[PDB]
Design a protein around this motif. Sequence first.
Motif, short mmCIF file in Angstrom:
data_model
loop_
_atom_site.label_atom_id
_atom_site.label_comp_id
_atom_site.label_asym_id
_atom_site.label_seq_id
_atom_site.Cartn_x
_atom_site.Cartn_y
_atom_site.Cartn_z
N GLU A 9 0.84 -1.19 0.00
CA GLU A 9 0.00 0.00 0.00
C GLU A 9 0.88 1.25 0.00
N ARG A 10 1.08 1.81 -1.19
CA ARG A 10 1.98 2.93 -1.40
C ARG A 10 1.59 4.18 -0.63
N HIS A 11 0.28 4.35 -0.42
CA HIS A 11 -0.20 5.48 0.41
C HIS A 11 0.08 5.31 1.89
N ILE A 12 0.13 4.08 2.38
CA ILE A 12 0.57 3.82 3.73
C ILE A 12 2.09 3.95 3.83
N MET A 13 2.83 3.52 2.79
CA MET A 13 4.28 3.73 2.79
C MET A 13 4.59 5.23 2.94
N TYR A 14 3.93 6.04 2.12
CA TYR A 14 4.01 7.50 2.20
C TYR A 14 3.84 7.97 3.66
N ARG A 15 2.80 7.46 4.30
CA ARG A 15 2.47 7.80 5.67
C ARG A 15 3.55 7.38 6.68
N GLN A 16 4.08 6.16 6.53
CA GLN A 16 5.05 5.62 7.47
C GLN A 16 6.42 6.30 7.34
N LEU A 17 6.76 6.71 6.12
CA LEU A 17 7.99 7.46 5.86
C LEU A 17 7.94 8.87 6.49
N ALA A 18 6.81 9.55 6.33
CA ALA A 18 6.58 10.86 6.96
C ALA A 18 6.72 10.79 8.49
N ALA A 19 6.03 9.83 9.10
CA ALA A 19 6.12 9.58 10.55
C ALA A 19 7.51 9.15 11.05
N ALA A 20 8.30 8.52 10.18
CA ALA A 20 9.69 8.15 10.50
C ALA A 20 10.70 9.31 10.36
N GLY A 21 10.25 10.46 9.84
CA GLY A 21 11.01 11.71 9.92
C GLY A 21 10.99 12.47 8.61
#
Length: 260
Positions: free
Chosen positions: A117-129
Motif C-alpha cells: 500500500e503505497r499510500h501507507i508507505m508514504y504515511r510511514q515514511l513521513a512519521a519516520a522523519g
Amino acid sequence: YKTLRLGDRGADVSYLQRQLIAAGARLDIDAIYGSATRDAVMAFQATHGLVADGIAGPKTWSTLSAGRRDPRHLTDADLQRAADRLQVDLAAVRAVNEVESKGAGFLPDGRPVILYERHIMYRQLAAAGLAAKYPALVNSKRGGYAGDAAEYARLASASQISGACALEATSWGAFQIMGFHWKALGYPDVFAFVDAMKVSEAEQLEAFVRFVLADKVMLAALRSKKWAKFAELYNGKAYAENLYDVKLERAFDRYSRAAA
C-alpha cells in the motif's frame, strides 16, 4: 479440479461424490451438490484436519485426491482456538473465516499473500522523519497494485527505501492484516510479525484475532453477531457492495444449524 459448493451440478460433482465415498461417505451419486453432499464434505474436512466449511476447494481436493495435507494450512482446531481467544461463538468464527479470509494465506511459491500500500508507505515514511522519485511505490494516492507474486517485487523495491516502513505498509496473510499494527498487536517488532506471517495460516489467523481484540467496538460487534456493523468496521464503508454483511449473516446461520 474446480472449486465446488452447494448448488453446483454436473460431472465434477459426481466425481466429488465418488471421491467422498472412496473416503468413507454414504451418498447417492446424482451429480447434485446438495445438503447431503455438503455435509459429507464437512465430515471429510473435519476428520482429516481441514477447515470444515463444506466447500470443496483446492485444499479439500488435495486431501481428497492424494491424502496430503499442508501443515501450513488452517485447521478446524485453529478456529476453535480463535473462538476461545475472542470469546465468540464458534459458528461466528467459522462465518468470519469463510467470508473474510482470502482462503489460501500463501502464494503457490510459499510466501504469504500480500498487498503493498503505497499510500501507507508514504504515511510511514513521513512519521519516520520520495513520492516524486518513486511514484508507483510511494504516493499519497492509493493503488498501483500488481497482485500475487508481483507484489513481492513492489515490496522488495519499497524495502530498499526503508525495510521496516515497507513491511508496515503491506497487508499479510489470509486476513490481510496491515504490518503497521505489529506494535498494537503485541508483536516484538515488524520483522517478527512478518516472520510469523510466513510460518502458517494459524499465525495469520492469530494476527486477525489480535487485530479484533485490539478494537473493542469491532470485537463487541462480532460477539453480538452485528454483521453489518462488523463488516463496516472491518471491510470499510463499501462493505455492502460486496455483500460482506449478508454473507456473514447467512454463513453464521449455516454454521449455527450445522452445529445443532
